[PDB]
Amino acid sequence: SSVPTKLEVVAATPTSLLISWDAPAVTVDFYLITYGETGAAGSYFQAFEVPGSKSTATISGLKPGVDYTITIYAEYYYEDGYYIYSPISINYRT
């Protein structure tokens, strides 16, 4: 059981995707969103960060016909640094 609990694409374009997730019952300080062609290496993502007060994000620059894997990580600060809950990922063909 991850955080966020559900992730979906709501608008589409050959080069753009609009993604949305739930509002949490836990505290999130920030989300780290990543994307890249599925079955590729990490050198090929491309990540960015969104407040924990947001439920949607826009990804652009994706070449069409390509299978992407998209991950949301949820980060809470502890006395150390930011730590994450389990993550949720979807695979999306533009």
């Binding site: 509002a23 007060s53 439920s55 600060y77 006395e79």
Partner: protein, 306 residues
């Protein structure tokens, strides 16, 4: 929630001071303008002193003040968040548009609100959160009818109580509202935060509706900008007379400010001293000034709030 003594306060000062040294870096070259962190942490520290001198003998009583405990643990938590921001942002902190710099200014805002909330609950250094007088009697009555003497309520409590008076459709709408009221970002609403909010989106009678029309679904709402941020953003639309925006001020909490682009090629700012912001917008729209919210052609309808 856990209890504050002097030792933990000294740790808090040393952490703030560490952040201060980090932000004194020449290569940072930090802004003059509020929220100016290198004034906020010194000022927060010194007000904390003024509290300590008042509760000089009465230290055990103060370590139990629920507001004071929540505030000291959040202050701890914020200054830690910031030090760790410098550590992971690293050299990217000396480039101004890097996102780490954005987060640094965001937390600068939070430190600012926190200072105003402390001075608001501890005027002259002595607790007055049980006798805080909410400016709006309609809102004052809600606060005391639901929580009484309390100075600070957990967010889910406040969520439930308010939901019975002004219901909320979704946790989405809830999280946006949370974003707005909880200026201190600790999951607690204070009587200070609540006062401010209930002043921005009065009438009480239609609180959340006013909040949705002016904040959630208005392209002209800017949250906290500075004066020169207002004009710097409207500098993009000199060609478009009547493009307008409105903002919140970190120095004048509970107040609105507006800026628009004139037909003379100027960018001028105004304050609706008398008129709820929706009326000031309505008048100024009919008056031919607030035509284009954020340089956009469709201007939202704020009739139906009357």
């Amino acid at each position: 929630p856990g209890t504050v003594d002097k030792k933990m306060v000294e740790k808090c000062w040393k952490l703030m001071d560490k952040v201060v040294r980090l932000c004194q870096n020449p290569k940072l070259a930090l802004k003059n303008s509020p929220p100016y962190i290198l004034d906020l942490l010194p000022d927060t520290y010194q007000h904390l002193r003024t509290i300590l001198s008042r509760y000089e003998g009465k230290m055990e009583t103060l370590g139990e003040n629920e507001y004071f405990r929540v505030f000291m643990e959040n202050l701890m938590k914020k200054t830690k968040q910031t030090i760790s921001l410098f550590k992971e942002g690293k050299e990217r902190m000396y480039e101004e548009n890097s996102q780490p710099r954005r987060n640094l200014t965001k937390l600068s805002l939070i430190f600012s609100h926190m200072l105003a909330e402390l001075k608001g609950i501890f005027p002259s250094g002595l607790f007055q959160g049980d006798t805080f007088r909410i400016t709006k009697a309609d809102a004052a009555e809600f606060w005391r009818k639901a929580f009484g003497e309390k100075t600070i309520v957990p967010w889910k409590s406040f969520r439930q109580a308010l939901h019975e008076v002004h219901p909320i459709s979704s946790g989405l709408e809830a999280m946006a509202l949370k974003s707005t009221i909880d200026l201190t970002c600790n999951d607690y609403i204070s009587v200070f935060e609540f006062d401010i909010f209930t002043r921005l989106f009065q009438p009480w009678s239609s609180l959340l509706r006013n909040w949705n029309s002016l904040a959630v679904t208005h392209p002209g709402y800017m949250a906290f900008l500075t004066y020169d941020e207002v004009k710097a953003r409207l500098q993009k639309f000199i060609h478009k007379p009547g493009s307008y925006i409105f903002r919140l001020s970190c120095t004048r909490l509970g107040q609105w400010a507006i800026g628009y682009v004139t037909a003379d090629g100027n960018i001028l700012q105004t304050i609706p001293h008398n008129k709820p912001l929706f009326q000031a917008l309505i008048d100024g729209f009919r008056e031919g000034f607030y035509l284009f919210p954020d340089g956009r052609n469709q201007n939202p309808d704020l009739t139906g709030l009357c």
